Subunit: 172 residues, 6 copies
C-alpha cells in the first residue's frame, strides 16, 4: 500500500483498493492494516449482496480513525485486492450504531471506460440505483445483534471532494 498513490489529481480522482465485489458471494473481505492481507470479516447476515464494488482509498483518515470508504457504482464485479482509479461523484450520509458513517459514491474514470461519460454527479445515476444503495446500507446488518443504520441523505460531488481532501490532510 505504501507505494499506491491516493490518486493522480485527488480528490477529482482517487485510487480505490477493492475489498468486496459487486454481487456474487455475500463475503465481506476487509484488508488488514498490519499485514496487507484480505481477511474474511464476515459472511453477510442478511440475504443481500453489495450493490457495487466496495473498498477504500489508501492514505486517508476519517475523524473516526478509518480510511475513506467508497462504493463504486459500475456494473461489473472487480477482483478483491485490485486497485481502480475512480471519480467521486457524491456521498451517502448515514448514522449507525457507531455514529456518523459517510460513504463516497464513485464511478470509473473515462480512461478505464467510456460508459459513464455523461455521469458527472450522483444525481445523474438512475434514481433506483441510489435507492438500492441506501436500502442496502440501511438493512444489510439487520440480523447482526446491536447493529442498525439510518439514512440521513445524499451530498454532492463537491462535498465528497472536501471530505476526501480533509482525510488526506488528517493522514499527514
Amino acid at each position: 500500500i505504501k507505494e499506491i498513490a491516493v490518486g493522480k489529481n485527488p480528490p477529482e480522482d482517487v485510487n480505490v483498493i477493492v475489498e468486496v465485489s459487486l454481487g456474487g458471494q455475500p463475503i465481506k473481505y476487509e484488508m488488514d492494516k498490519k499485514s496487507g492481507a484480505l481477511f474474511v470479516d464476515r459472511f453477510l447476515y442478511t440475504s443481500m449482496v453489495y450493490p457495487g464494488n466496495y473498498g477504500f482509498v489508501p492514505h486517508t483518515l476519517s475523524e473516526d480513525g478509518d480510511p475513506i470508504d467508497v462504493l463504486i457504482c459500475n456494473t461489473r464485479p472487480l477482483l478483491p485486492g485490485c486497485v481502480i482509479n475512480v471519480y467521486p461523484i457524491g456521498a451517502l450520509i448515514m448514522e449507525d450504531d457507531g455514529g456518523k458513517d459517510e460513504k463516497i459514491i464513485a464511478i470509473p474514470t473515462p480512461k478505464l471506460t467510456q460508459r459513464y461519460n455523461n455521469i458527472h454527479d450522483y444525481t445523474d445515476l438512475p434514481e433506483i440505483t441510489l435507492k438500492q444503495i441506501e436500502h442496502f446500507f440501511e438493512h444489510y446488518k439487520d440480523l447482526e445483534p446491536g447493529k442498525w443504520a439510518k439514512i440521513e441523505g445524499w451530498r454532492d460531488k463537491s462535498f465528497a471532494h472536501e471530505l476526501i481532501k480533509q482525510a488526506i490532510e488528517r493522514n499527514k
Copy 2:
C-alpha cells in the same frame, strides 16, 4: 405441466417447478399459465437475492387463486424450469399488500441428497437461516411502489402438510 405429478405421496413429498435460482442474478422468473414458458416478471428492486431456490407445486391452488409457493432451503442453485422432489418441513406465514401469504419451506429428499438426513422440521435448520428467509420476504419488495410485507410467524410441518392437502383438493 399436465404430465407432471403433484408428488409421489403428497403432501409428505411434493414436486416443485423451480422459477428462481438461489443467489446468482436477481431475476424473478415466473412460469406463465397458458404457455408454460418462463417470463421475466421483474428484476428485484432491492440489492437482495433469494435465500433458497423458489418455485411452485403444480396442480395446487391456494385460497387466493395461485399454486402453492415453496422455498427450497438447499445451498446449490437449480436451473429455472427444472422439477425437484422435496419434503415440506414448515411454512412461513405473512401478510402483504395482497392479504395473507403462506410460503412452504422445503428440503430435497434423501434420494436426491444425504446432506439433510437430520432435518425433519423447519426448526432443525440453523436459526440464522430462518431469520434470513423472514427478512428476505419482509424486505425484498421494499422499493416496489405500494408493495409491503410483515411476518406473522412460522408453522410446523403438519401445518404445511394440511395447507398443501387443502390446495390439492381445491385444484380439483
Copy 3:
C-alpha cells in the same frame, strides 16, 4: 409459442424469446421452428461475446421470412428460452452475406426495472455502447468462411415501431 403474445401494446412493447445470453459462454443458441427446442447453431468463431441479450419476437415475419430479431441492451444475463417484455428504442441497419439485416435495439420496460427510466431512444444509450454493438455485428463472423457484415447505420424508435408493425402484419 402460439400462446405467447407479440406484446401488450405492440410495437411500443414486444415480448422477446431470448436465444443468447449477454456475455458468458460464446454459444449461439437458436430456437428450432418445428420443435421449439433451443439448438446449438454454433460456438462463435471469434473471441467475442454478445453485447446484449439476443432473441426474437414471436409471430413476426421480416421480408426475408424470419422473425424480428432484438438485441436487449441491459446488463444482466437472461436465461436462454425465457420471455422478457421490452421497449424497442431503435434499429441497427446492416448488410449481411445474405442481404439486408435489421436488428431492433431494445430495453426492458419500467415494470421489470426502474434502471432505464430516462432511456427512450437508442441515442440515450451511451455512445460507446452503440459503437460496441456495431463493432460486434461487424466482426463476430470474421473467421466464418464466406460470411461477412457491414453496418449501414441506425434508425430511430419510430422506424423500429414501423418495422415491427409491418412484421406483425406480414405474419397475418
Copy 4:
C-alpha cells in the same frame, strides 16, 4: 422431442439433448419420459463433476430400455435442455449394478466449431481425457448405496455407429 430428428445422417451425426452440463454444479438432471421436463435425479454423492456435457439421443432405444447415452467431450458448458449435433467417435463399455452400460463419446461437428477438425476417433483425444472419463464413471457413484461401476474398455467409432444404428431400428 417428437419433432427432433435423430440426426441429419445418423449414425455419423446425431442430435444430443443435453441433460447435465460439464463442470459447474454436481446436479444430475434427467429428462422425464412422459413430461419432457428436466427433473433433478440427484445431486452427485461424490465430490466429482461431469468431465463433458452429457445427454441422450432421442428416438433410440438400447437393449436396456433407455435411449442411447452420449458424453460430449468439448470444454464449454451447455444449457441442460438444449440440443446439439455431434459426431460419435467411440464408446466406453461398462458394467454396473444394473447390467451392461455403453456410453457414446462424441464431439461437436465442424459446423458448430472448427476446434476439433483433427479429431476423428476417440483415440485422437488426449490420453488423460480418456482416463478421466473412465475414472469418473468408475467412481462418481462410489458413495451411493448399492451402486457400483467397473470399466470394461473402449470401442472404436465403427462400433459406436453400429450401436446407434441398432438402437434406431430398435426404437421402430
Copy 5:
C-alpha cells in the same frame, strides 16, 4: 506479508487459515510459495473432481515433515485464494500417502463470521455424507497422477486436532 498474520486469536481453539484452493469451481490447485508469498499453480487436478471445501494452511506452524498445518474448511461458499479466514478446528482426517503421514484438519468458520454453524462443535456434527465425500476426495483425487497414492486411516476428534496444532506451533519456534 505472512510474518504479520497471527496463528489465531486463541489457538488452537481458533486458527487463521490462508486459503489456497476454493471449494468447487475450477480444478486448480494453487499452492502458496514460501519464498515469495505468491500463489503458484501447483497443478490442474488429474481427475474430474473438485475440492469439497475451501483448503489452505495455518501460518507459523510446522509438522514433523516440515510443512505447515493443512486445513479443509467445510463451509459451502467459495473463498478467494490468498484471503485469510478465522476458523474453529473440529476434527482431523488421518491418511497415509506417497509423502508419508498426512493429517488434515477439518474446520468451520467461527460464529463471528457466520451464525450458520452454531450447532457444529465436533466433526461428528457434520452430515455423514459430508465426511464420506471428504474422505473419498482425498482418497481418489490423485488417482491419475503417476506415483501418487493415498490410504484413509480414519477420523480423529477436535481434541486431537487441538494437540496437533499446539505441537506444530511449538515446532515452528
Copy 6:
C-alpha cells in the same frame, strides 16, 4: 516479484504472472512494477474477451522496456496475480501504436497437466485457435482512440526461445 524466478530451465519453461483471465469479465488488469498490486488498466472497449490467460514473465525486458508478454492458450481461467509455469511454443508478431510487439504463445507444462502432451509447437494447436488469437489482438482495441494494431505473422518456438533469452539478459 524479486523472489519469483524467470523459470526453472528458461527459455524452455517460463513463469508467467497472470494479469487477465481467459474469458469471463473484460477487465484488463495490469501489475504495477513499483507497488506489485493489480490495477485495472481499463475495461475492454470492444465486446471481446481474452482468448487465453494473459500475463508477463518476471525479470525480462523487451527493447521497448516492458516485460515479455505471454498468452497461455489453455481453456480454464486462472486467477490474476497467480504464477504459472508454461512452455513457450511460438510467438505472434505485430505492430501497434507502441511500435514492435511480440506476444509469446505458451501452454502449461506436463507437470501441471497432461492435456497438452502432444503440443510442442504453435502449429500443433487447432488452426481456428491461432486465427482467434490473431483476430483478438488485431481488433480488441478497435474502439480505443489512437490505438491500432496490424498482425505481421507467426514465428516458431525457436524464435520464441531466442526472444525470451535476449529479454532475460537485457534485464541483467
